[model samples]
Target: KALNFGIISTESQQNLKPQWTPFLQDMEKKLGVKVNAFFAPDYAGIIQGMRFNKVDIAWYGNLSAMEAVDRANGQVFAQTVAADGSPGYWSVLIVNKDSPINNLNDLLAKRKDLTFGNGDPNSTSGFLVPGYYVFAKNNISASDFKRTVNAGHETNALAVANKQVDVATNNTENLDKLKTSAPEKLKELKVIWKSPLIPGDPIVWRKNLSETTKDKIYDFFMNYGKTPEEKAVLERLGWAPFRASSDLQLVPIRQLALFKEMQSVKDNKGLNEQDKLAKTTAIQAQLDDLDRLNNALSAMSSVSKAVQ
Candidate 1:
């Protein structure tokens, strides 16, 4: 059957269709399946498509994948292994190279006057991890910052370069790509802080897929970058290889879900009576599950340092 693959439009613009057409064509030929590529304007759109079974597979951020797993009973079948063979990456807090801010502490100290460049609200490395840096460590609210801007990560990077925003939360992989492709803009920014490791984006497929097809898809991706041309494309995306993964890999995504629910609770001031009550109750339930998972993760982390 033909496979519809959806990718989130985040770091790159949709108009750059030329950049991905060749890759899609190649996948179609190699997989012996009609591969149709679609773009979701935002993370929520991609999640909705998955829920409706409109997409057979999706390249999703960790957080979005979690939502898919929750909504579709999906599984993350593969994830990028970094150049060093690591299964994850980090988020960076960037500021002007000459800015006075030297660390997260500095940013928190001046939170009232600072503006921030955030990726989409559902972004894992761009929003979730960075938000945790503020909420968990500094205990600062989003309102603490004078302004919060949302756009592509590259746009955020440029915002800092142009002095339009005081800081930007960026994925380290995307930051490195921009540094290589646009050195001038990269030069204008410096990393003031970096979050602990966050899992790489995963290739998630709906649970309804046949087990035979699921294994085949998993094998295809795990071996996709073995050839020279495939390796080049993988390198361009900062991946050394793709590895097999599963729903169990979504622990970080669950944490991000908790953070998002909490933010919703904080922003419920304008909701109508019934809406407010429903949202509060729903968020509280998610928070309780998150707390349970965190406790389990913390206990596991004692014996293994990989869960962070």
Candidate 2:
């Protein structure tokens, strides 16, 4: 059988070839199947591919995985456990080492002089964390900045280092990857704020996949990284071992998104009547949808366990 494998494009094409080739080769050999790598420049592209069944399986960030399971008939098979067996990572805001925005307060106060790179909205750490903690908390919008652009973690971090942008959104995982791949450049940056722990990225597959194939893929992931050669591939990819996961593992991300929405709605100190009503109506509707999702997931899990 052939496999359509989707990987989120977080690095350059030239760089990612070396990063993923070994892992794909090992998977092809292990499963005795052809694997066509699917690269999507944005996380939404991969989710859309899954929506139409063009992509069969994927590596998704925490929030993206939640969307896959919710919108694209995707199922959680496994999640990455960090190199030292950590379960999650931090979301951070970074600045150049020499920048006067020494802390979050300084950045907030000196905002008019700064150019910002907030990162892709699809990114959990890059967008959600910072949105919930910084922007929404302070009732500040991107438009308030001197200039703002959303870009990839590496590009954003590099822009800060090169002084092209004054500040950027990053996370612990990408920061560590930069340290490994470009230590001197990493040295030129400092994290001004770090968020609470957010769950690691997940491995997901379409719900329609045959049980035999699903089991084969799951077994491959759950066991593969135990070998020395497999760990080396993981090192190149800056990935950790894959362990069994379930939809329940994604609850935190959903809750965070909901919490962020609620926080935004509650912060109406300066909103005009029109804006306040529009935002309130939207938040309430989303909260209703989230409640339904949680209840449905609970019901489904109960039925699944009983049937088993």
- TM-score per candidate: 0.79, 0.86
lDDT of 2 at 72: 96
Q: Against the unseen true structure, what C-alpha lDDT does each candidate score?
A: 0.77, 0.84
Candidate 2 wrong stretches, greater than 4 Å = 269-308
Model 1 residue 242 CA deviation in Å: 1.3
Clashing pairs in model 2? none
* RMSD score of candidate 2 (Å): 3.7
- Candidate number with greatest lDDT: 2
lDDT of 2 by residue, 1-308 (tens): 67999987565556567878899899999999998899877778888899999999998888788888889999998988787666689899999999877778998998998899987778888888888888887889777789999887888888988989999999888888787667898999988998899988889999999989999898899998888899999977667777788987887687678777777767767777788778878877877777788888777744434543
The residue pairs that clash in candidate 1, if any, are none
**Residue 174's lDDT in candidate 1:** 74
What's the CA error at residue 291 for candidate 2, in Å? Answer: 11
Q: Which regions of candidate 1 deviate over 4 angstroms?
A: 14-22, 210-216, 256-308
